[PDB]
Amino acid sequence: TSWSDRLQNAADMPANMDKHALKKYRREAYHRVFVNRSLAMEKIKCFGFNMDYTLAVYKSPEYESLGFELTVERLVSIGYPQELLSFAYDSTFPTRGLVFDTLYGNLLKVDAYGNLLVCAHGFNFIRGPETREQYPNKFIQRDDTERFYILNTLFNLPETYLLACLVDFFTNCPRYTSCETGFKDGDLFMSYRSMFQDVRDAVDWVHYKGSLKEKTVENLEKYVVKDGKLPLLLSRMKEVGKVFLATNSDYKYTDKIMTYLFDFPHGPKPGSSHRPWQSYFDLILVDARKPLFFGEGTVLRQVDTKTGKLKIGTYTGPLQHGIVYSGGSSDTICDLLGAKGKDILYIGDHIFGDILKSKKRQGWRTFLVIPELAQELHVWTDKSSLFEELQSLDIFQRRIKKVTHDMDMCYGMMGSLFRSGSRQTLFASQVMRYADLYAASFINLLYYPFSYLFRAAHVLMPHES
Amino acid sequence: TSWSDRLQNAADMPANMDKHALKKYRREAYHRVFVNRSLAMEKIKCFGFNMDYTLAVYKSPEYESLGFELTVERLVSIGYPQELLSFAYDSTFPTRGLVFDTLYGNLLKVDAYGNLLVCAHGFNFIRGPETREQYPNKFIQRDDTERFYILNTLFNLPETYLLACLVDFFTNCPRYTSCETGFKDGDLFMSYRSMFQDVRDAVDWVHYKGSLKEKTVENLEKYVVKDGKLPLLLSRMKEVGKVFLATNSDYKYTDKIMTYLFDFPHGPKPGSSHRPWQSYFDLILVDARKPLFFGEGTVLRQVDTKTGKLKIGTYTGPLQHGIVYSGGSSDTICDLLGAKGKDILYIGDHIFGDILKSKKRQGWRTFLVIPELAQELHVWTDKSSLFEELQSLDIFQRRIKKVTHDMDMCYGMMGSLFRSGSRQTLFASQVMRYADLYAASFINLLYYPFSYLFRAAHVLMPHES
Ligand SMILES: Nc1ncnc2c1ncn2[C@@H]1O[C@H](COP(=O)(O)OP(=O)(O)OP(=O)(O)O)[C@@H](O)[C@H]1O
Numbered sequence: 038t039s040w041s042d043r044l045q046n047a048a049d050m051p052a053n054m055d056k057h058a059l060k061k062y063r064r065e066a067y068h069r070v071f072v073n074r075s076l077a078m079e080k081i082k083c084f085g086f087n088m089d090y091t092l093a094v095y096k097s098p099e100y101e102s103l104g105f106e107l108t109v110e111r112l113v114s115i116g117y118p119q120e121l122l123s124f125a126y127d128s129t130f131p132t133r134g135l136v137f138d139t140l141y142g143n144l145l146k147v148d149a150y151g152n153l154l155v156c157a158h159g160f161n162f163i164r165g166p167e168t169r170e171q172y173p174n175k176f177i178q179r180d181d182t183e184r185f186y187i188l189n190t191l192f193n194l195p196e197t198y199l200l201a202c203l204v205d206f207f208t209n210c211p212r213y214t215s216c217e218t219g220f221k222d223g224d225l226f227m228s229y230r231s232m233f234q235d236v237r238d239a240v241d242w243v244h245y246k247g248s249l250k251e252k253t254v255e256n257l258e259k260y261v262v263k264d265g266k267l268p269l270l271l272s273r274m275k276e277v278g279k280v281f282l283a284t285n286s287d288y289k290y291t292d293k294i295m296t297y298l299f300d301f302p303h304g305p306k307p308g309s310s311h312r313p314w315q316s317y318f319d320l321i322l323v324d325a326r327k328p329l330f331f332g333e334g335t336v337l338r339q340v341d342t343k344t345g346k347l348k349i350g351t352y353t354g355p356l357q358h359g360i361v362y363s364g365g366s367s368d369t370i371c372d373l374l375g376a377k378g379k380d381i382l383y384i385g386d387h388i389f390g391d392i393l394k395s396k397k398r399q400g401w402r403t404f405l406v407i408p409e410l411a412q413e414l415h416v417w418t419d420k421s422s423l424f425e426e427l428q429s430l431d432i433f434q435r436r437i438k439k440v441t442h443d444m445d446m447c448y449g450m451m452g453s454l455f456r457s458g459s460r461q462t463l464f465a466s467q468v469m470r471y472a473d474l475y476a477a478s479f480i481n482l483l484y485y486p487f488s489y490l491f492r493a494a495h496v497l498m499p500h501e502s
Numbered sequence: 503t504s505w506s507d508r509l510q511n512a513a514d515m516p517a518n519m520d521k522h523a524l525k526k527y528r529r530e531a532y533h534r535v536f537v538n539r540s541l542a543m544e545k546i547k548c549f550g551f552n553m554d555y556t557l558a559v560y561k562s563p564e565y566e567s568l569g570f571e572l573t574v575e576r577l578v579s580i581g582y583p584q585e586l587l588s589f590a591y592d593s594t595f596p597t598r599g600l601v602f603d604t605l606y607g608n609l610l611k612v613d614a615y616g617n618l619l620v621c622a623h624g625f626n627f628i629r630g631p632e633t634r635e636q637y638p639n640k641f642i643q644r645d646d647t648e649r650f651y652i653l654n655t656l657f658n659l660p661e662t663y664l665l666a667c668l669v670d671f672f673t674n675c676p677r678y679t680s681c682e683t684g685f686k687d688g689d690l691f692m693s694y695r696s697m698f699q700d701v702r703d704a705v706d707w708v709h710y711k712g713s714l715k716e717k718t719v720e721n722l723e724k725y726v727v728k729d730g731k732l733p734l735l736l737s738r739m740k741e742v743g744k745v746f747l748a749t750n751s752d753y754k755y756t757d758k759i760m761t762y763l764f765d766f767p768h769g770p771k772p773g774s775s776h777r778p779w780q781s782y783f784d785l786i787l788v789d790a791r792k793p794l795f796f797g798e799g800t801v802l803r804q805v806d807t808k809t810g811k812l813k814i815g816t817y818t819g820p821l822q823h824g825i826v827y828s829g830g831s832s833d834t835i836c837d838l839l840g841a842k843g844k845d846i847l848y849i850g851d852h853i854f855g856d857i858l859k860s861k862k863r864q865g866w867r868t869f870l871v872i873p874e875l876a877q878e879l880h881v882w883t884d885k886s887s888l889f890e891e892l893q894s895l896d897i898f899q900r901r902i903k904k905v906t907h908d909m910d911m912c913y914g915m916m917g918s919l920f921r922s923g924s925r926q927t928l929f930a931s932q933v934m935r936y937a938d939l940y941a942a943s944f945i946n947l948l949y950y951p952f953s954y955l956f957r958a959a960h961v962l963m964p965h966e967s
Pocket residue numbers: 149179180181182187189388389862
C-alpha cells in the first residue's frame with residue numbers, strides 16, 4: 038500500500054456535501070487540513086494552483102519506477118555500464134528531503150541545523166563514530182550549495198534511489214577502486230560530484246528531451262490519480278474568489294494532463310454539463326520558471342493555444358478571456374487579478390520553489406500538499422506506543438538508539454519524511470515555518486466551510502512561559 | 503530605571519555559593535537561563551566569549567547618550583545643520599531590532615515574515631490604512647538588504663533614535679520640501695538612503711576615528727557595569743574546560759576594558775591574589791571581524807602586546823602561553839583548542855554576527871545575552887493581566903487594537919523587543935531559532951551546577967499532535 042493507493046481510494050469517492058457529513062469527514066486525520074499559522078479563509082480572494090504533484094498526483098511506485106527506468110536508459114546510452122540495466126526501483130529505500138553530499142557520496146538525513154540524523158553510503162548505513170571521520174562535528178554547512186544538494190520533491194525520488202544504487206555498484210565492483218571523493222577506473226577518475234551531475238542531467242533530459250512525458254500521457258490511468266471532486270472544489274472556489282494555475286510545465290503537457298483530470302461525463306456535480314478544464318481558471322500561466330517567478334521572473338509571453346507555440350514578442354495586453362500566458366512573474370498575477378499577496382492562497386508541493394519562496398518573497402498565504410502524509414499518518418498512529426515509549430525514556434541510552442531505529446524502519450530504510458525518532462528533519466522544520474496550511478491533498482479544503490478560521494495557537498518564548 | 507540599573511544591582515552583589523542558595527536564586531526570572539534547545543552542560547569543553555555588550559555591558563542611557571552626542575557632532579562637522587545640536591537622546595523611543603527602510607524613511611517593527619507590526623516616519627506613527635500606501639501588502643522583502651537595514655545591537659540604539667529625529671527635523675522644517683524618497687532643499691536632493699548612509703558612516707567614524715573610545719575609558723565607572731562575580735565564573739569555567747575571548751574590538755581597547763572589569767583587590771573569590779585578565783583565557787583573539795570570522799575569516803596575525811601593534815606577517819606558530827591573536831577564523835579556535843563546534847558554547851550579544859552565524863556556519867552551541875531582558879521581564883509580569891486579557895479576546899476587534907497599543911507603550915514608543923501584542927517580532931523569532939540558551943546576563947550560568955542539563959520540550963508538528 039502506497040500513499041497513492043490511499044489518495045486514489047479517497048478519490049474513488051463521491052462528495053457528500055451535507056454540512057454534518059462534511060464536519061464528520063474532516064475529523065479523520067487523513068481528510069484534515071493542518072494549521073501552522075492562523076488563516077481566515079474569508080480573506081482569501083485568489084486560490085492559486087500548481088499542477089504537477091498538486092492537481093496531478095502521479096501514482097506510486099509506477100511513475101517513480103518509470104522515471105527511474107528511463108534515467109538509467111539515458112545514462113547507459115551516454116556511456117554508463119550496462120549493469121545499471123539490472124537496477125529496478127525500490128520504493129522502500131528513498132525518503133524525500135535527503136541531502137546528497139557530492140564530496141563523499143553519501144545520502145544524509147539532517148535536521149534544520151545541518152545535524153546528521155542518518156548517513157548512507159550506497160546501501161550501507163553509517164552509524165555513530167564511523168561517520169565522525171567525514172563529519173567530525175556531525176554537521177553540514179547548508180550554505181555550501183555547491184556540495185550539498187537537497188532532494189525536495191517527489192520528482193527526485195527516483196534519483197535518490199539511483200545515487201544509492203550507483204555508489205553501491207561502483208563500490209562493490211572490482212573494476213573500480215574506491216577513493217574518498219569518487220572512483221578510479223584505470224586512468225579515468227569519476228568523482229561523486231560528476232556522477233551526481235550526470236544523474237541530474239539525465240533526469241532533466243528524461244523530463245525534457247526523453248519520453249517520460251509521451252509515456253505518461255499514453256497511459257494516464259496507470260500514472261495519474263483522477264478525482265471527481267476536483268471540479269467541484271474548483272467551482273466552489275470560483276464562487277467566492279479568483280482561481281489561477283501557475284505551472285513550470287509547458288502548455289501542451291498541461292493541456293493533456295488537465296484535460297484528463299477533468300474527464301468525467303459531468304462538470305462540478307454529477308448531472309451537470311461537462312466543461313473544459315480552462316473555464317475553471319481566471320488566469321492560466323505556463324513555463325512559470327519557479328522559483329525565479331517569485332523574483333524578477335522572465336518576459337510575459339502569450340500562448341497560441343492552437344499550435345501550442347508561443348506568440349513572438351512580449352505580451353503587453355490585458356487579461357482577456359481564453360488567454361494563456363507563459364513566463365512572467367508573481368507580480369503579473371497580482372497585477373492581472375488585482376490581488377495583494379495576503380489575498381492569495383497558493384497551493385503547491387515544492388517546499389522550496391512553491392511555498393518558501395512565495396511566502397518570503399511576496400508574503401502570499403501558502404498551502405503545502407504532502408502526498409506521503411496519507412501513509413505517514415497511518416503509521417504515526419499504529420506505532421504511537423513506539424513513539425510514546427521513546428518519549429518516555431527521554432524523561433526517564435543504548436535503548437534510545439535501538440528504539441529510534443525500529444520506529445523509523447516502519448517508514449522505510451531512510452525513515453520518516455518528518456523525523457528520526459525525537460529529532461525533526463529539515464523538511465519538517467521548513468513545513469512548520471513556511472506552510473501556513475498543509476495536508477495529504479488539497480481536496481481536504483472541500484470538507485471545510487467557505488469562511489472557516491484555521492487556528493494555530495500563539496507561540497510563547499521560554500521567558501514568556 | 504534602566505536594564506543597566508537592574509544589571510548593576512545584581513552586579514553589586516557577592517556570590518553565595520551554597521548549593522541551596524544557588525538553586526533558590528535561579529528561581530527568579532532575572533537570574534534564570536532560558537532554554538530554546540536542550541543543552542547538556544557536561545558536553546561543553548570550551549566557553550567562548552565576546553566582550554562588548556557581553557563581558558563589558560555599557561551603562562544605559564549614559565553610553566547611548568554619549569554615542570548619540572558624538573555622531574550628531576560628526577554629522578554637524580561634516581555639514582549637517584546646526585539644529586541637530588539641540589537633539590538629545592531619548593531612551594524611551596528606540597527599541598532594538600527595528601528595520602530602517604531607506605526608500606521611504608520609515609522605522610519598521612516587523613515579524614519573522616516581514617509583516618508590519620509598527621511603522622514610524624520620524625515620530626509620527628503610521629496606523630492601519632495610511633501605511634498600505636507605501637506597503638500595499640503590509641510586508642517587506644527581508645531579502646532586499648539594499649533597502650532595509652536591521653538595527654541588531656545595543657550599538658544601534660543611538661542611530662535608531664537619530665534617524666527618527668532627522669526625519670522629524672527635515673519634515674517639520676520649512677527650508678526643506680518633503681518628497682516620497684527624501685528631501686529637497688533648493689537644488690540639493692537628500693534621499694533617506696544617503697541620509698542613512700551619512701548616519702551609518704558617522705557612527706562608524708565615532709567608534710573608529712572619533713573619541714567615543716577615549717571618552718569611555720576615561721570614565722569607566724560611568725560607562726561600564728563591573729561585577730565581582732565575573733572572575734569567579736571564568737575561573738569556574740576554566741576548571742572544567744577551555745575559555746576564550748573573540749572580539750571584533752582591537753587589543754588596546756580590549757586591554758583597557760578587560761583590565762577594568764577585573765579590577766578588584768582579589769582574584770576569583772575575596773581573599774585571593776588578583777590576577778590579570780589574560781590569565782583567565784586559554785586563547786585571546788582580537789579584530790575577529792565577525793561574521794566574516796565564521797566563514798573564510800582573515801589572515802591570522804599575532805599581537806605585539808607591548809606596543810599594541812600587529813607583528814608583520816601571518817602567524818604560523820602554535821598556541822603558546824601569552825600569545826594574542828588578531829583576525830583568523832573560527833577554524834583557528836577549533837584547531838588551537840582542539841574542539842568541535844558542539845564542544846563550544848559561545849556567549850555573545852549580536853543575534854546575527856555572534857549567534858546566527860556561529861550556529862549555521864559551524865554548529866557551535868550558542869548563548870545569547872539580552873541585557874534589556876532585565877527590564878522586559880519586570881514589565882512582562884506586572885502587565886500579565888493586560889496580556890492574559892488580550893490572550894482572552896483572541897479566544898472570544900477594535901478592543902484588540904486598543905489593548906495591544908497600551909500593552910506595548912509600557913516598554914516604550916516602539917514597544918517590546920520581543921512582540922507587538924500577540925505577534926512576535928523578527929528578533930524574538932531569531933532568538934528562538936538560533937540561541938540555544940539566552941538570559942539577561944551570562945553571569946546567570948553561575949547559579950547552575952557544573953553538569954546541568956538545560957531541557958527544552960520536544961516539538962511536534964500539528965498532524966503529530
Ligand atoms: N529546501 C531547499 N532546497 C533548495 N535550496 C534551499 C532549501 N532551503 C534553503 N535553500 C537555500 O540554500 C541556501 C543555503 O542554506 P541556508 O541554511 O543559508 O538557508 P536558510 O533557509 O536561511 O536556513 P534556515 O532554515 O536556518 O533559515 C540558501 O540560499 C537557502 O535559501
